[PDB]
Task: inverse folding
């Protein structure tokens, strides 16, 4: 059996929305043998998370996914069995006509942003009748049931465990990036936005008794790192030493290589949606920088995740983790919040592995999506399940 899938992605900003839809598109084609067309309105954003891509090509097949440019004006084509509107990006007019014209009209899904709030359970899989007659279904990724789950490839944790149990595989990957760990040096990856709390944290890493290696992929936070280092230029391959802190700049690497980087580090500073979850699959301590929103509505998503993630932690670790995460997202941290958290990183690592294993036994999002279409198809013909 093979169904066809349309996935529409409007790169509003950054690389998370194309990062998530690309990850889903690959999984649908590789693990489920589905026919997948991914529509992106900005090919240059997709080309940086998938270096094999050609930005000027109007159509190309990568990892079994037909990646097509979302054109203006929109070239009319036939609609697939399932049309995934990612993050309410609005489908083309003529494509909704093509969805409605089919003998079996397309299943219309709206892929929502991931949230840990409890209320998304009451809205997951909710149908909404549109004016044209078709219904749209809201799909909420989640950390608890009911929800749409989390993106996770098949055998992901099995590969991660073998990678982290092999000193040679970790050193071999870091050597490809030009990274050489020192004995006793803690490894921290930095992926965030502009953050006024960064200099306060880099000062504590500098003055610490134990040394740290700060690996910074090229991106937004690099100007802040360069400002703290009192340097004008910060290029890929540069290394600067500030007492106990080694800062090394990494390239913006392929998505799967970013996973291996997350797997090497003892603490991963991540952000947004995809890298926030990928750091959890790494089974390592992490730091989440969520971008500020209207008023302060990003505070709700942060506290919702903190309540769930800290539920299994010891009181001391949970309290220090909370205060640090809030300060890291407050645009102005706390001068001593790192000392209390650094001393508990070995125990935090153990709890992060338990968190990954327990989340890893929930069915993945791509499987629930494929199962949603199966139950929806059988129901459409009033058949049993
Ligand atoms: C650092 C790095 C990241 N990546 C990938 C990881 C991610 O899939 C992707 C980045 O996506 P995210 O983790 O979600 O962070 P982001 O900041 O890039 O995107 C986010 O911006 C917010 C404003 C939105 O609210 C979110 O919905 C989301 O789109 O880039 C690489 O491929 N190589 C790299 O070196």
Result:
């Amino acid at each position: 059996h093979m169904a066809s899938w349309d996935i529409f992605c409007s790169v509003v900003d950054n690389y998370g929305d194309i990062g998530v839809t690309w990850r889903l598109a690959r999984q649908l084609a590789a693990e489920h043998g589905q026919a997948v067309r991914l529509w992106v309105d900005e090919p240059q954003a997709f080309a940086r998370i998938c270096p094999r891509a050609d930005p000027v090509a109007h159509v190309q097949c990568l990892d079994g996914v037909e990646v097509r440019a979302w054109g203006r004006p929109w070239a009319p084509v036939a609609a697939a069995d399932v049309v995934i509107e990612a993050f309410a990006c609005e489908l083309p007019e003529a494509h909704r006509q093509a969805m409605r014209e089919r003998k079996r009209p397309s299943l219309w899904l709206n892929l929502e942003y991931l949230s840990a709030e409890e209320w998304i359970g009451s809205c997951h899989a909710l149908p909404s009748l549109q004016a044209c007659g078709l219904s749209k279904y809201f799909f909420f990724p989640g950390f608890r049931e009911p929800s749409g789950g989390l993106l996770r490839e098949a055998g992901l944790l099995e590969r991660r465990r073998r990678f982290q149990a092999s000193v040679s595989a970790q050193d071999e990957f870091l050597a490809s990036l030009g990274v050489r760990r020192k004995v006793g040096e803690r490894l921290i990856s930095l992926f965030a936005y502009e953050n006024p709390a960064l200099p306060g944290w880099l000062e504590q890493l500098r003055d610490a008794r134990q040394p740290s290696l700060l690996l910074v992929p090229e991106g937004r936070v690099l100007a802040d790192v360069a400002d703290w280092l009192r340097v004008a230029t910060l290029a890929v391959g540069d290394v600067h030493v500030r007492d106990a802190l080694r800062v090394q700049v990494l390239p913006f690497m392929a998505q799967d290589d970013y996973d291996r980087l997350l797997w090497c580090c003892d603490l991963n500073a991540v952000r947004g949606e995809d890298s926030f979850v990928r750091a959890q699959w790494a089974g390592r301590p992490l730091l989440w920088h969520i971008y500020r929103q209207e008023e302060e509505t990003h505070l709700a998503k942060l506290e919702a995740f903190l309540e769930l993630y800290c539920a299994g932690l010891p009181a001391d670790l949970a309290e220090n983790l909370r205060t640090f995460w809030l300060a890291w997202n407050a645009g102005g941290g706390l001068a001593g919040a790192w000392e209390g958290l650094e001393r508990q990183l070995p125990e935090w690592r153990r709890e992060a592995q338990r968190w990954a294993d327990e989340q890893g036994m929930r069915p993945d999002l791509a499987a629930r999506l494929v199962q949603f279409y199966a139950d929806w198809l059988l129901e459409h013909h009033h058949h049993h399940h």
